[PDB]
Design a protein around this ligand. Structure first.
Ligand SMILES: Cc1cn([C@H]2C[C@H](O)[C@]3(CO)C[C@H]23)c(=O)[nH]c1=O
Ligand SMILES: Cc1cn([C@H]2C[C@H](O)[C@]3(CO)C[C@H]23)c(=O)[nH]c1=O
Lengths: 316, 308
């Protein structure tokens, strides 16, 4: 009965996620830990041409009033599909190999992913909605498509003060502070949402506490108010019927959001430290993560093959 | 636990699927109708019209293939939302196969694969969707649960054109090139399920598409559409990311149970044939004691809100 440890490193761009993941992997034996990198080659060439350049280019032309919100939404929506494809297809092929949740002995294999499918199907789309370039209905359609949450889904989010974050970003994409704020807010909201659900929060019971505007710990702390969760973003006029509550189609999508996030294992990594400091901190966090059994005898080698294949073909 | 019979009425538009499903249920049989209100108002404004106008603009050379594909892509997300959200919430209620009449019969107007696979594939055949986008939607197809019975149609082309002309939805343009494409995709779909059920291995047969248990040839299945040059490396090999999506397609389609309804007849004749087809469909148990009444509620609420 070989066990597997899956860890998805996620959160806003520019905090040091990629470095620290590589550093952690460099500490292990090549055969017992494998890095699933960002699929940059899929994004710039294989799925479409220079998808990142197109997203940045679209938000800029919308911001400058050169294209309409509608024109922006179509490009952003199609672009996000391209951005999420390698994550969704990897999740789908991995799925059959994942058994139940297995502290416990060291895992036979550890897979560290640079992001989870919810980055492209939920977080970046929600931030683009805040930026005016995605409709809330399209964000909810993406949510309804998030794959069932496999057992042992450990997600590591990141903490980094805005000023240090902004500092790192003056490195070269395009320098969008509003987008940085939006993606930090969405990942904030996501950590609070997982805690709200894990504390027994029912969005349907608390929906009425939202009426207002905009004024995190994913696995500690008291229960957050629904106003500090992702459910706050969907009180948009577009989604409300003439009686005032959400149309049922959108309510069901929120039911799906709850189901998917409630069973996840979320951890917060302080990135306000040197690269080796982030590496250790993540390594200490990796000890409280949930492992799973695998379903077949050869699932370990198959999974390892999948991960190396992915890295070779799609990472730079 | 009580048993459930799920029946997805699908296939090319213009065949009379909605006419014949109306008649079928015209409290132990509930209909999840075509979510026309989502398409025209709730999800976006007149998405049908936007899809047919875009293809028309592309056919006339007013917009580029790239401009069309972005619109078709974004619009297929809108079209499929009602199906995807319905499947996501119904999923936890479906238990294993049960194999006497079911406690509930849920008849749907289409399955999620219409919007995540068949319409995208037809638009690729129409030059208005990239094959990479079709495989992105394929990777997102929900896992096939037990008892997924899908009814596809059979109808001669000329008769289908006649019926298509009467069944025009709001914003639709009569397009015989799209009719041919959607008829080709659904025919390929039926052959693909048979291919996979008789043990066909797309990876083993792939060379037959380029290097020259009775089952259809692979060139007569959906896999042939994915020999698209955009998905291949300079040496001709398919990129693994796309091969994986084809592995997902094989997994999702193989376990669906396909039934063919002859539409070349009257609405009562079509309705009657549909009912004859139900004896071979697979029923499942539900997972909770309360699964039945809540599924019924889902179905009525969907209908009331999104049905025309
Ligand atoms: C995952 C994801 C990323 N991105 C961009 C922002 C980020 O800085 C990046 C590297 O992660 C360049 C690519 C999106 O726009 N959408 C997405 O779904
Ligand atoms: C399911 C589906 C339908 N359609 C159109 C064709 C059809 O005739 C219709 C009603 O069934 C108008 C809507 C698409 O364009 N994409 C789709 O995924």
């Amino acid at each position: 009965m070989p066990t597997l440890l899956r860890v998805y490193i996620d959160g806003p761009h520019g905090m040091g996620k990629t470095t620290t993941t590589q550093l952690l992997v460099a500490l292990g034996s090549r055969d017992d830990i494998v890095y699933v990198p960002e699929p940059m080659t899929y994004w710039r060439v294989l799925g479409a041409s220079e998808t990142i350049a197109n997203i940045y280019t679209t938000q800029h032309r919308l911001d400058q009033g050169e294209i309409s919100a509608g024109d922006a939404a179509v490009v952003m929506t199609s672009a996000q599909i391209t951005m999420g494809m390698p994550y969704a297809v990897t999740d789908a092929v991995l799925a059959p190999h994942i058994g139940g949740e297995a502290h416990a002995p060291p895992p036979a294999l550890t897979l560290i992913f640079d992001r989870h499918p919810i980055a492209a199907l939920l977080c970046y789309p929600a931030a683009r909605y805040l930026m005016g370039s995605m409709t809330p209905q399209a964000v909810l359609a993406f949510v309804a498509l998030i794959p069932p949450t496999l057992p042992g889904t450990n997600i590591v989010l990141g903490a980094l003060p805005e000023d240090r974050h902004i500092d790192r970003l003056a490195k070269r994409e395009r320098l969008d502070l509003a987008m940085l704020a939006a993606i930090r807010r969405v990942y904030g909201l996501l950590a609070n949402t997982v805690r709200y659900l894990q504390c027994g929060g029912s969005w349907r019971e608390d929906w009425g506490q939202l009426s207002g505007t905009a004024v995190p710990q994913s696995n500690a702390g008291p229960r957050p108010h629904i106003g500090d969760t992702l459910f706050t973003l969907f009180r948009a006029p577009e989604l409300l019927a003439p009686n005032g509550d959400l149309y049922n189609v959108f309510a069901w999508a929120l039911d799906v959001l709850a189901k998917r996030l409630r069973s996840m294992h979320v951890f917060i990594l302080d990135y306000d430290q040197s690269p080796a400091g982030c590496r250790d901190a993540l390594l200490q966090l990796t000890s409280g993560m949930v492992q799973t059994h695998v379903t077949t005898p050869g699932s370990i080698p198959t999974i390892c093959d999948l991960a190396r294949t992915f890295a070779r073909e799609m990472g730079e």
